[PDB]
Symmetry: D2
């Protein structure tokens, strides 16, 4: 099953979509500069693109640290981004009350991985009717995603993206099971599956991210989810050139 | 470090405290009957006892399974339990706004494992000044508990309990690392450590509980249904008490 | 199922047996000294005792690592241990041809964790007729132990001990699943189950008593451990053995005094 | 570092080599029949191929499963395979004493995962001077492989292949860490790394394909892969050409691009 996001077709047998932005929003001008960079590179390589950012840093280093511009001033910035660049955007929500006002502005709303079993937040996200990205818990088996999908469906929303972010592997480590992509497709009605390479991790780091991105996208996925300021930006170009080459080849092979 | 909960002393070198009850408050009369049975058995054996229930169960099996009686009626039921039996009670909170009204009624307030790194909720819990039970997420290592305790300390509350509930082990399975208890004791200032055997998992329950309490713990945390069958409570606790009394009666032995 | 080893009754509802000793045989005189300590401490505490050591470390990280005194020498040392103290002994075997020679002397022969799938080794062990200690591989689940037991049974030897030594947990770490003990009891005909606390601690050392108590709380035939007066650093300081075992016996006596079910 | 195996160049920047065949040798007739299938499919696509079988398998699933025809007849069968098809072969050895006579015939000798730390076998294998395939145990981290490599180097042999077969993930299940390939390359001197997709899985065909493609996307010297019409199930043969067409497409694309810039 494909999902239309404005002008974009997102699906497991479409050209891959890049989801990319920043960690948490800070300022209007800083958010435009970075989005401008993603847009320039993606445009000239011919890759569809959705801008990602959080208005809130829910888990903070200190009880005293910067948190982000918050919801009220977060949304303002998203509205600009969309006006200036005419692309879709994606952000995470944590409280049920937040869900409808955020869906007003943000094309895709994201269910955080820690919160995926919180039935309140599931129902409230569903009721927006917006496109939803479900982050797979690092503790959850791929064949259990069907149970989250069922809850969304019972609540009346079928516009769901499943998002891989790694599985717990001993203490303080993650491994990505490349077999899980297929299990989610097979058990969840071939909804779009995307791969969050950035959170699945943690010059090698740069190199490591490329290997892992290529491996995931070899399994035939709707999109790649990532971040940068942790990946540089002349590298962004070099990285995507290689991802698009592989994606194009894979998607040209009959299933 | 010990913590006083009314007339109970909770600590890793004290007689174990049972945190026992049911999953979610659904009723008044049945809650009281179940609590009455815990009270009778624990009084008979001289085991300190705290009644547990949730008033608001997130993470239910279906979107319309009953979430429980909710905040206002839940606190009223907790008040009746406290008035009838004279025991402390424990419940969980899910939002900052719930922290004040729950803490006014409940002797212990619990940070759900899935929310354990949510700073706003940690700060709001800390600021109640209440005793807090921190549930260890299955995906979190035992040496990372100190980061949660530091956040509470920064916000001015040191009356903290650490609660083991198992660790993710491959897909859809849990293992309890018995070495984790000591790591928590040693890195977190010897705060009280308790063991949630119910959520870690029924001869199995008994083996797992005995194994845990053998490592010298402040408390044991479990749920029954009228979850261990309620009528087998006395037999279960007699065996746990036997082991706890033995272990606690010997001075700690240090290995290099 | 109980197993008689000379005068010792080994079983999951009998008083725990200590399988105790050292990483590797280094000489006769060091061996005799350490064994003497084990024997005098266990005798006074009333704990049945089997002496343990390897004659070869067959899988160290250098081809010039120290490997111990080797087979022919090692068996001579086991011979003297048995004559002097009158106790049973246990050692591991790494190659099929070793089995019958080693079994003529060593009462219990041990299948190494890495080698459990080695069919020729299983068969050669089984044929000796000796009591066998099966190390549960770090990569094998407790409900598949039955598969190794089935092979020994098909090869005609039913005197088998199941030895827990930890489970792989991510990279380079182990965890001990306290529920595995009961799984092994239920699926392998209540054969004696024992706990190797030393190797379970590999990656801790300060935590050996807590881990050993936790395992014995589940009601076990035996405890398996190494001391030092060869390693990942988890051996018990030898002088601490008496105080260590006082605690283990206290718990075992309690658990074993409670009816089961 | 590349390894020359007769006419074949094996290395992580070279076209991928297929390793595959049968579980155990039974007879010359049976072996030639199976080998011919692989040879014909790989010749049709221009993929270098190395035939695998055991002459005496020590880790089968029951104690009376057939272990193979044995050393003496096994080596005669390997000799004929080599003569008939002009390809290299590979076999596992589990006894030190068997290393020398096997190495007279078999181009690659394979160290079983369960014996990967056994010093006496490692030394006896090294001293043959043959190319060696080191099977990585499911309990070993990728950064431990260096230790095995060092033991071979100490004993005089650096013609080593590292073979990934998955890692223990909770109970029973194996997972393949796609980051492990890079860790082995970086720590072990860019020795050839190959991927045993079949074991890694302890229908089954669609799975095998995704996992194989993901591994080869990381830039690898070869693929280890069982096919025909035990402990680990093989890919059905009518699928072999179509499977290999897809692996070769990805491999050619990847190998044709330079490793990233500084
Ligand atoms: Cl709870
Ligand atoms: Cl068999
Ligand atoms: Mn040792
Ligand atoms: Na209170």
């Amino acid at each position: 099953m494909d999902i239309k996001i404005n002008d974009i077709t997102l699906g497991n047998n479409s050209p891959f979509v890049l989801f990319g932005g920043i960690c948490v929003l800070e300022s209007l001008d800083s958010t435009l500069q970075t989005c401008a960079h993603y847009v320039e590179v993606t445009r000239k390589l011919g890759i569809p693109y959705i801008f990602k950012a959080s208005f809130d840093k829910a888990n903070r280093s200190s009880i005293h640290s910067y948190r982000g511009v918050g919801l009220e001033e977060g949304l303002k910035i998203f509205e600009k981004v969309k006006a200036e660049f005419g692309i879709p955007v994606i952000t995470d929500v944590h409280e049920p009350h937040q869900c409808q006002p955020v869906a007003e502005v943000c094309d895709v709303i994201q269910l955080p991985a820690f919160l995926a079993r919180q039935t309140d937040l599931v129902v409230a996200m569903a009721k927006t009717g917006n496109v939803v990205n479900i982050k797979k818990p690092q503790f959850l088996s791929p064949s259990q995603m069907k149970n989250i999908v069922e809850k969304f469906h019972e609540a009346g929303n079928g516009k769901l993206i499943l998002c891989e972010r790694g599985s717990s592997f001993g203490y303080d480590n993650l491994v990505v099971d490349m077999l899980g992509f297929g299990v989610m497709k097979q058990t969840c009605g071939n909804l779009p599956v995307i791969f969050d390479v950035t959170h699945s991790l943690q010059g090698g780091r740069r190199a490591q991210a490329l290997d892992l991105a290529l491996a995931g996208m070899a399994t035939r996925l709707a999109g790649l989810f990532l971040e940068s300021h942790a990946l540089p930006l002349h590298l962004l170009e070099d990285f995507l050139i290689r991802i698009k080459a592989l994606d194009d080849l894979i998607k040209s092979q009959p299933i």
